[PDB]
């Protein structure tokens, strides 16, 4: 996302605000991120320098994110050498993802001194390095680089500074003179021709479809500061630029400054990334156990197919009992009429009396019947976990991060994993009511059992997986009855479904029947479908 064109944009809009700025306080709130408070234009405001490998940027920023309890090692040098210092200049350094700050400072006897601070925004190996402007010595860098990496450059304290290698990419018709008619993937050729540009910009440029007017428009529009600060959403992924986006299929939102763009894009990034990681790491775990339980029924069912037909040993026992007056000790078979009038040749034990032969079939029957009941209760337990994990995965797929932060506790309590007033999350409803719901099972159970009496009307999806939701103690108008279904269909056994019915019931039923199975009685259902965010 952050690009040489964006680097030029920052180099100007910072110099509109930071020219002659006194650095009033420096602090390092995060491992690879450093804040300068700067007094300029009579105002006291924050510049963020970041060399985080994914999220690296230079960024004037509203949010007072944190200030550290620690004074960490790089930060202390910037406090020693450029806090109280005066920012003379900001420069684009060949435009490809580097910014230079030239800064004035004084020594411990008041002699005047000049420092260069280099922020390199080169992706996975972005870095921030401080240097003397007369001697070119690195004082220190936020990341060191030991010369055994054998790169063109070494980054060590007291060694001379250097800029990274230029790619032989030309500074910004001449591309049509390099371009080959056998090349698809044209964004590769555009990025290989021009400096200061990266694949999303080059891909949107290609999607303008010759394209010289497109590239000459873009480079002029950038130089002229004609751009729009823009964020976009492309189903799940979200991106930003100082650009209009040519043909990207997504949503869009715009602002007055690059500061607010970089704020509004990165402020949630750390939490969204942390959660999506841990939430998928819970999803992966539940999938393994749900697979293991479904495979445990697939085991037991085909195993039960080798059980005997208990009804036949029962029926033989009865038939021998009834015939028992005729039989003699140690005939090999009994020819017996069934109580329709077939005759079964029942085989006998040759030494047992005919009584003992009757008891022997009743014993085999009792073993068979017992074994089937034992395997059916194994199947019942595995079915409970299958159903519960179907419901759980519905919820986990559709839960907020805050509601995922409830779910794990129930599974640690469920012993599958290892290690207060609120429950519902609530939104507007028809006839101007307020409707409560919860995506977490224990929270839904605590909401449906206690937001309302027994006599009230309360609701769910009619499918076998759902979220439980209600307006509080309601008996609201038929408009509310027709609106509840859209919230139920935003949280049913499938998303975006076409005809999946809703259900509503008197809360004398919907009591408890693993967790969060409810008993159904006193109930109704209506056909329904998924809906837009207007379902709030």
């Amino acid at each position: 996302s952050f690009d040489g064109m964006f680097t030029y944009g920052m180099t100007h809009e910072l110099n509109e605000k930071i020219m002659g700025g006194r650095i009033t306080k420096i602090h390092q709130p995060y491992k690879h991120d450093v804040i300068f408070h700067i007094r300029a234009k009579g105002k006291n405001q924050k510049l963020l320098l970041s060399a985080h490998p994914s999220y690296s940027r230079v960024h004037i920023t509203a949010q007072a994110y944190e200030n550290p309890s620690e004074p960490p090692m790089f930060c202390m040098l910037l406090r020693k050498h450029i806090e109280g210092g005066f920012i003379e200049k900001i420069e684009q350094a060949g435009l490809d993802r580097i910014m230079i700050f030239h800064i004035k400072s004084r020594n411990e006897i008041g002699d005047e001194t000049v420092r260069k601070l280099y922020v390199e925004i080169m992706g996975r190996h972005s870095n921030i390095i401080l240097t003397d402007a007369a001697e070119n010595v690195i004082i220190d860098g936020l990341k060191h680089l030991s010369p055994s990496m054998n790169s063109y450059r070494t980054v060590l304290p007291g060694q001379d500074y250097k800029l990274p290698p230029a790619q032989d990419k030309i500074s910004p018709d001449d591309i049509l003179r390099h371009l080959s008619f056998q090349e698809g993937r044209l964004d590769k050729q555009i990025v290989d021709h021009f400096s200061g540009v990266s694949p999303l910009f080059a891909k949107e440029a290609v999607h303008r479809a010759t394209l010289p007017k497109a590239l000459l428009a873009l480079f002029a529009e950038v130089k002229e500061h004609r751009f729009i600060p823009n964020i976009t959403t492309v189903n799940g992924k979200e991106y930003f630029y100082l650009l209009e986006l040519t043909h990207l299929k997504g949503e869009a939102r715009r602002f007055d400054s690059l500061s607010e763009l970089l704020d509004r894009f990165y402020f949630g990034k750390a939490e969204r990334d942390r959660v999506k990681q841990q939430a998928q790491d819970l999803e992966r775990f539940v999938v393994n156990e749900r697979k293991k339980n479904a495979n445990k029924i697939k085991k037991l069912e085909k195993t039960l197919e080798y059980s005997e037909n208990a009804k036949e040993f029962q029926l033989y026992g009865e038939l021998l009992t009834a015939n028992l007056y005729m039989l003699k000790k140690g005939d090999k078979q009994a020819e017996v009429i069934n109580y329709e009038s077939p005759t079964i040749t029942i085989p006998l034990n040759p030494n047992k009396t005919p009584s003992e032969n009757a008891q022997a079939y009743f014993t085999k029957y009792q073993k068979a019947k017992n074994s089937v009941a034992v395997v059916e209760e194994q199947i019942r337990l595995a079915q409970e976990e299958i159903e519960y994990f179907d419901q759980l995965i519905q919820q986990l797929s559709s839960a907020s991060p805050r509601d995922i932060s409830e779910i794990r506790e129930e599974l640690v309590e469920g012993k599958y994993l290892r290690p207060h007033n609120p429950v519902l999350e609530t939104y507007e409803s028809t006839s101007g009511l307020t409707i409560l719901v919860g995506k977490n099972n224990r929270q839904n159970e605590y909401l449906t059992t206690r937001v309302a009496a027994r006599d009230d009307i309360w609701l769910h999806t009619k499918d076998i997986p759902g979220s439980h939701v209600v307006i509080r103690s309601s008996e609201p108008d038929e408009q509310t009855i027709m609106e509840a279904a859209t919230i139920a269909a935003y949280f049913s056994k499938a998303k975006d479904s076409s005809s999946v019915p809703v259900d509503y019931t008197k809360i004398r039923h919907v009591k408890k029947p693993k967790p969060g199975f409810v008993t159904y009685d006193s109930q109704h259902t209506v056909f329904v479908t998924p809906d837009a965010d207007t379902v709030i």
């Binding site: 090692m73 790089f74 060191h144 030991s146 010369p147 055994s148 060590l156 304290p157 060694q159």
Partner: protein, 83 residues
Amino acid sequence: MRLDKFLKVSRLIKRRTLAKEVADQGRISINGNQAKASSDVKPGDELTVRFGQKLVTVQVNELKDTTKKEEAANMYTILKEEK
């Protein structure tokens, strides 16, 4: 302390096994003499290292058995790079 252990804690090499390997290839000299992986090293010693073509000469300033990551760079200083 040994050379291989010194190159590892000073973060001149990532893996101790490679520090051993490079010294056992003879790509290291101490005080101008070629040096084995076991070689003693002290502050005020000169090391020359062949990182591919890049002949780096460094002097040791400190000795440690453990460090924080940034503090490892504090251990030693370069004096010349050649190729």
